[PDB]
Each structure stands twice: as C-alpha cells, then as structure tokens.
Amino acid sequence: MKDFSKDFLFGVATASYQVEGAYNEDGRTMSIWDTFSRQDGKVYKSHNGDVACDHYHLYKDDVKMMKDLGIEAYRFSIAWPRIFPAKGQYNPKGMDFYKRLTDELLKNDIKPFATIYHWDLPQWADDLGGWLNREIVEWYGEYAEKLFSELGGYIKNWITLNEPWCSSFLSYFIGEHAPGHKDLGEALLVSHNLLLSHGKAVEIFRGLNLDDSKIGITLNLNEVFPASDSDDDKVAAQIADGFQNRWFLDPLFKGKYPQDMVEYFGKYAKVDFINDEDLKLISQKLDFLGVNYYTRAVVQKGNDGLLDAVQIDPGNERTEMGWEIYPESLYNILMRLKREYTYDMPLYITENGAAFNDVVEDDGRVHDEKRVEFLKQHFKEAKRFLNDGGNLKGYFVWSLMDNFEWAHGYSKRFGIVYVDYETEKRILKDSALWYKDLISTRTI
Numbered sequence: 001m002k003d004f005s006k007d008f009l010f011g012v013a014t015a016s017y018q019v020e021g022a023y024n025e026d027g028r029t030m031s032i033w034d035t036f037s038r039q040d041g042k043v044y045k046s047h048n049g050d051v052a053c054d055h056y057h058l059y060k061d062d063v064k065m066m067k068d069l070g071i072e073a074y075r076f077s078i079a080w081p082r083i084f085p086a087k088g089q090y091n092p093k094g095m096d097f098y099k100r101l102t103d104e105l106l107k108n109d110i111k112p113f114a115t116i117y118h119w120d121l122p123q124w125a126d127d128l129g130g131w132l133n134r135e136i137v138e139w140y141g142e143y144a145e146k147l148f149s150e151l152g153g154y155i156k157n158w159i160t161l162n163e164p165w166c167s168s169f170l171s172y173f174i175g176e177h178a179p180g181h182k183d184l185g186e187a188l189l190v191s192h193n194l195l196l197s198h199g200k201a202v203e204i205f206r207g208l209n210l211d212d213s214k215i216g217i218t219l220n221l222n223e224v225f226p227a228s229d230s231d232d233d234k235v236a237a238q239i240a241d242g243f244q245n246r247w248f249l250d251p252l253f254k255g256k257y258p259q260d261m262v263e264y265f266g267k268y269a270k271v272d273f274i275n276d277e278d279l280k281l282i283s284q285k286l287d288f289l290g291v292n293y294y295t296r297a298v299v300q301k302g303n304d305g306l307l308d309a310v311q312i313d314p315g316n317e318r319t320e321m322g323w324e325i326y327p328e329s330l331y332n333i334l335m336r337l338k339r340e341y342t343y344d345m346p347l348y349i350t351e352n353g354a355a356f357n358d359v360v361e362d363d364g365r366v367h368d369e370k371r372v373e374f375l376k377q378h379f380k381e382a383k384r385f386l387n388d389g390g391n392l393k394g395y396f397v398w399s400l401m402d403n404f405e406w407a408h409g410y411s412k413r414f415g416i417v418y419v420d421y422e423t424e425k426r427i428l429k430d431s432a433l434w435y436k437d438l439i440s441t442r443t444i
C-alpha cells in the first residue's frame with residue numbers, strides 16, 4: 001500500500017516578508033519588520049526583506065519548481081500591508097498579487113493554505129498601538145473579511161495566525177522580534193488580543209458559510225523534559241511547558257487560560273484581561289490545528305527568578321540554530337494533542353525543517369545530507385503517528401527555499417531549495433530531490 005495516502009498533503013511553507021521582496025511596490029507600505037530591521041542591532045548585519053528571494057516577481061518560476069517536485073499543497077502568508085497599506089484603505093493591486101499567485105498554484109494542482117497573519121503588521125497599525133490596542137481586533141477582522149470575500153474562490157484552507165507565542169512573548173517580552181518590547185505585562189495582553197483577533201476571524205468565517213472551506217490556527221509547540229526527577233526540575237518543566245504550549249492550547253481548546261500560569265504570571269504582571277466573553281470567542285470550534293515543530297527543551301530549575309530555567313545541553317546532535325534534533329517529540333506532541341486537546345480533530349504539521357551550513361559545491365549541487373536525514377527521521381514519526389490512529393492530514397516542510405530568517409537575517413538557511421541571493425538563482429538541494437521521491441513513492 002502507501003505509507004501516506006493519496007489524499008495526504010505533502011507541502012512546503014513560506015511567509016510573505018521572508019520571501020517576497022518588492023517591499024515598496026504596487027502600493028505596499030512598511031510593516032513592523034521593515035521598521036525593526038532598520039533599527040541598529042536588531043537584525044543580523046542589518047539584513048532586511050527589501051528584496052529577499054524576490055518571490056513577488058519570480059512566483060511563476062517558483063510554482064513551476066514546486067510542480068516539478070510534485071508538491072501537493074503550499075502554505076504561504078498574505079501581507080496585510082499590501083492589502084490595507086493605510087487604515088481603511090483597500091489596495092486592489094495588493095490583492096491582485098495573491099489572486100495571480102493562487103491562480104498559478106491551482107492551475108498547477110497545488111492546494112493553497114493561506115496564513116492571514118505571519119508577523120508583518122502594518123506600521124500604521126503599530127503606530128496606533130498595535131497588538132496592545134484592543135481595537136486591532138476590528139482592524140484584523142476587517143482585513144480577514146476582505147480576504148475571505150475576495151479570495152474565497154481561490155483558497156479553501158485558512159490559518160488565522162502563525163505562532164502567536166512569537167508575536168507576543170518573543171516580540172514584547174524577550175524583545176528579539178518586532179516591535180521588540182521587553183515587558184511581561186505587554187506580552188500577556190498582546191497574547192490575549194492575538195487570540196481574540198483569531199476569534200473574530202473565525203466568527204466572520206462561520207457567518208460567511210463558504211463552501212468546502214476550513215479554518216484553523218498555527219502554534220509552535222515543543223516538548224519539555226525535566227533535567228532530573230527532582231521536584232525542583234518538575235516545577236521548572238511545568239512552567240516552561242505552560243509558557244510555550246499550554247498558554248495557547250488551553251484558551252483555544254479548553255476555553256480557559258492554564259490556572260497555574262495565571263497565578264505564576266500574576267506574581268509579576270497584571271492578568272486582568274481575562275474574562276468569560278473573550279474566552280468564548282477565543283475558543284470557537286476550529287476545523288484543524290496546525291503544528292509547527294522543531295525541537296524539545298531539557299530544563300532544570302534556575303534562580304527562582306522570572307522564567308529563568310537553565311537550558312540543559314543533553315549532548316546530542318543539533319542544527320545551526322543550536323536546536324537539538326529530537327524527532328520523537330514530533331510523535332509525542334501529536335499524541336499529546338490527540339489525548340489532551342484536539343482528540344479526533346484533523347492536524348497538520350504546518351512547519352518542520354532545519355537550518356544547516358549549506359554550500360554549493362564545485363559540481364553545482366548542495367549535498368545537504370544532514371537535512372535529508374533530519375526530514376527522513378521526522379517523516380518516519382509522522383508515519384508512526386498515522387499508523388497509531390492519529391488524524392494527520394498533511395505535512396509542510398519549512399521551507400521551500402532559503403529566506404530571511406527574522407533576527408538572523410539571511411544567515412540561517414532552512415530551504416530544501418538553495419537561493420543564491422546575488423543572482424536569485426534557485427538550486428535544488430539533495431533534500432528537495434529526496435522529498436520529490438517521497439511524494440512520488442509515498443514510501444519511507
């Protein structure tokens with residue numbers, strides 16, 4: 001038979017600011033990431049996404065490249081600053097790009113999966129307070145409603161937000177991502193307004209009753225292991241798990257923030273944004289959950305400070321991000337969702353992949369055998385989850401191509417296709433050739 005059914009979706013994923021370029025063309029105005037990458041010290045070597053992979057101009061070649069690999073589904077994001085470059089000011093020229101992109105996908109038998117928000121908030125919205133201003137729920141709803149109405153005939157699979165943990169905690173508490181604040185109370189409120197905005201889009205979507213169309217959200221999830229069996233490390237792992245995973249899983253799928261984290265965060269910041277009406281909107285039923293999985297964490301108790309767990313190096317192989325290669329946690333997280341949160345609801349892996357030190361050798365090839373083995377190990381866990389009764393509907397490799405990796409700039413390469421940025425040439429890596437064979441044979 002087939003390890004992966006004919007209906008299982010083998011996909012690849014990108015995001016608008018990471019690949020498109022054309023940052024000032026056809027009416028697009030700045031996003032928070034255009035602004036952030038221009039602030040000294042925020043992004044590696046002051047890299048930015050002015051040009052990136054030039055996918056805005058090269059999309060037809062890129063779709064042909066996906067067709068020739070046999071890609072069945074393509075996850076991309078839609079740039080809010082192209083669609084509403086000013087508050088309340090719709091830009092048809094921006095919408096026209098996503099129509100010609102998705103028309104090209106459909107004509108090449110590739111199913112579009114569209115992420116509505118993948119971090120490129122319009123600068124005009126941030127200047128009005130951004131995700132800290134509860135009015136953003138209405139601005140985001142207007143934006144999502146316009147996408148559903150204009151693109152509903154092109155796109156049948158919608159993702160409201162990508163990785164709200166990054167847009168809240170990494171952007172407003174840790175400060176690594178745009179807009180780069182460092183205040184726990186802000187990050188908590190932002191996390192709530194993100195989830196409420198997701199809820200507004202789901203409410204709008206259900207009211208439109210679009211035929212054969214599905215909506216979900218994408219979360220980056222990990223698995224947290226205590227470094228030892230001590231009570232100290234058990235509490236440390238519980239906090240780390242609540243910080244990364246349960247803070248978003250619980251309001252979405254239980255209609256309640258995790259009470260141990262509410263009490264823990266409440267010692268350090270306000271948690272008064274919580275109320276019944278908002279949690280009802282936040283927890284509306286979804287059609288699927290998208291899982292972004294990369295690695296686990298092994299943690300031991302720190303200094304009893306705020307979120308200060310010591311990161312333990314268990315001595316195993318890692319990527320160029322420093323992330324442990326630990327494929328069993330993909331299976332463990334999918335099973336955890338099946339047993340604790342999503343039950344029989346469809347799951348997609350909406351990102352999994354790895355950054356390695358890729359070089360084009362004298363033969364013109366990129367022999368990225370570490371990425372081949374990485375993807376092989378993780379697709380084997382996906383197969384094991386399926387064979388154990390898990391409802392996995394597809395798997396999107398991060399990424400189709402090397403691109404702008406946020407605060408790391410272009411210094412981390414995640415593609416199965418190599419991009420020579422000087423010429424914008426695409427070179428299939430050995431991982432792409434391996435993936436092409438997996439899709440064709442459906443055997444691993």
Ligand code: NA
Pocket residue numbers: 016017018019020021022023049050051052
């Ligand atoms: Na860009």
Ligand code: NA
Pocket residue numbers: 037038039046047048
């Ligand atoms: Na810059």
Ligand code: NA
Pocket residue numbers: 252253283284285286287
């Ligand atoms: Na749901």
